[PDB]
């Protein structure tokens, strides 16, 4: 049979061994029979990639100039995986994604089909209760969830598998009462140990109404993630990532104290050093007493602590916690200016929910995580469904009913929902300015013709 399901999409199949040619041919045929724009094949086993820098420029020149939408691979063991997956945000999906997507006649979510064996929560649809957490806690839990391949939802549904809460006192528990209520150690365990949560340990992580005292929570945390030896030791082998670096941790990161211990152990197990700053510290003397401090880690770009810090140490690296975890995924220390806009201390909110309640289409996998992060730090909301509650539709291209409906509603002078591309979101944040989404550059819905227009490149 045939269809237009994959219309205007470019694919790249990585063949890891000659025995996989029949399934490579069988997948190209499904993609062509359903009207894909282009499907390149690349044989990993038939080229020497030793001592050639398979970097971002190498990849764009070798397989562009237009975007690749999906890389099809049943392994992540190839030397441009990190460039594809963490920088360019191109999904990497198994052969089965093509089969299932054809059978269901829809572009399925990429997460369950990732072959990264670290993506231990690829199945989970996770609600994180904002009422339960500070901003900086929420951002860290989302970072690690995304790094574990899970999906973040901002609504409870039948699809939802997990609800992350801090304590029985949290108001989300009561007002609700299938899916399971757990403490954030459910996330952190998978991250630290890289194996599923199955023992009696798995029982500790579930919401327990007897835990009305702080002393009990502290005690489950020290048990579940306190004390070590982990699985899949080969997956992040650079145990000196932060050697000769020393991080000053801002007091505007008011973490649950065991959560700070986790971040300190993560840093220190990667051979870095950590000093916590407090609000009453004299900063000149802290930095003079610890002159090897070369990085500041903070939540807000407008912290007074960060202003005085820059004055004392004007060459300090200035990052956020997200920045640490991105260095973790690249497995290389990397200056903030070479990372992404989301790896800086956050700007003050630009928009309100009322100005900015956006919906989006054709963004898979990490690009999805990225629009969501961007909307958050811009001050708005994002929804999975397009309704009339929405102020904008963000789009890359012109396909999908979602675009057609929203492009129709934008012709009405009363409605006035706006259709714009993602660079409006990005340039707004970078310039810290409410730019105009009907500008020429933000009406370009042919971004796929160039890979440099991939969401997340602006600010690099």
């Amino acid at each position: 049979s045939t269809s237009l399901l994959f219309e205007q999409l470019n694919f790249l199949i990585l063949v890891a061994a000659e025995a996989e040619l029949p399934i490579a041919h069988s997948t190209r045929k499904l993609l062509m029979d359903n009207s894909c724009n282009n499907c390149q094949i690349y044989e990993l086993y038939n080229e020497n990639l030793k001592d050639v820098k398979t970097d971002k420029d190498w990849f764009m020149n070798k397989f562009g100039p237009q975007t690749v939408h999906f890389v099809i691979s049943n392994t992540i063991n190839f030397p441009f995986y990190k460039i594809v997956y963490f920088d360019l945000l191109i999904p990497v999906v198994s052969h089965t994604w093509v089969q299932d997507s054809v059978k269901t006649k829809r572009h399925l979510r990429t997460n369950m089909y990732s072959p990264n064996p670290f993506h231990l929560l690829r199945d989970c649809q996770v609600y994180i209760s904002k009422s339960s957490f500070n901003k900086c806690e929420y951002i860290l839990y989302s970072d690690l969830l995304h790094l574990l391949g899970g999906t973040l939802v901002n609504y409870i549904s039948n699809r939802t598998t997990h609800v992350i809460v801090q304590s029985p006192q949290d108001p989300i528990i009561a007002t609700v009462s299938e899916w399971k209520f757990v403490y954030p150690i459910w996330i952190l365990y998978h991250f630290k140990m890289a194996k599923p949560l199955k023992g009696e340990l798995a029982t500790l992580c579930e919401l327990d109404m007897q835990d009305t005292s702080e002393e009990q929570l502290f005690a489950k945390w020290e048990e579940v993630i306190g004390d070590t030896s982990s699985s899949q030791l080969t997956l992040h082998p650079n145990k000196t990532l932060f050697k000769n670096h020393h991080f000053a941790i801002s007091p505007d990161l008011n973490f649950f104290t065991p959560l700070y211990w986790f971040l300190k152990g993560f840093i220190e197990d990667l051979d870095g050093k950590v000093t916590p700053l407090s609000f009453s510290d004299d900063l000149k003397s802290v930095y003079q007493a610890f002159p090897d401090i070369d990085c500041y880690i903070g939540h807000s770009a407008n912290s007074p602590i960060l202003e005085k810090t820059k004055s004392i140490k004007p060459e300090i690296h200035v990052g956020n916690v997200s920045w640490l975890f991105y260095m973790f995924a690249l497995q290389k220390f990397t200056p903030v200016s070479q990372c992404k806009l989301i790896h800086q201390p956050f700007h003050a909110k630009l928009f309100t929910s009322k100005e900015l309640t956006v919906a989006y289409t054709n963004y898979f996998g990490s690009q999805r995580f990225y629009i969501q992060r961007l909307v958050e730090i811009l001050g708005g909301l994002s929804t999975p469904e397009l309704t009339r509650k929405n102020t904008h539709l963000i789009t890359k291209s012109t396909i999908g009913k979602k675009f057609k409906v929203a492009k129709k509603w934008s012709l009405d002078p009363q409605n006035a929902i706006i259709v714009t591309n993602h660079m409006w979101l990005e340039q707004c944040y970078m310039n810290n300015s409410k730019l105009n989404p009907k500008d020429s550059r933000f009406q370009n819905f042919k971004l796929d013709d160039n890979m440099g227009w991939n969401i997340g490149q602006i600010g690099m």
């Binding site: 399925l108 209760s129 609504y155 549904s157 108001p171 929910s353 469904e385 397009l386």
Partner: peptide
């Protein structure tokens, strides 16, 4: 009305929208 994801919510996003340090 509602155009689905294409890749149904009961408790909406705007209800529990605040962080405990807002």
């Amino acid at each position: 009305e509602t155009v689905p994801d294409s890749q149904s919510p009961l408790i909406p996003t705007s209800v529990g929208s605040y962080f405990r340090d807002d």
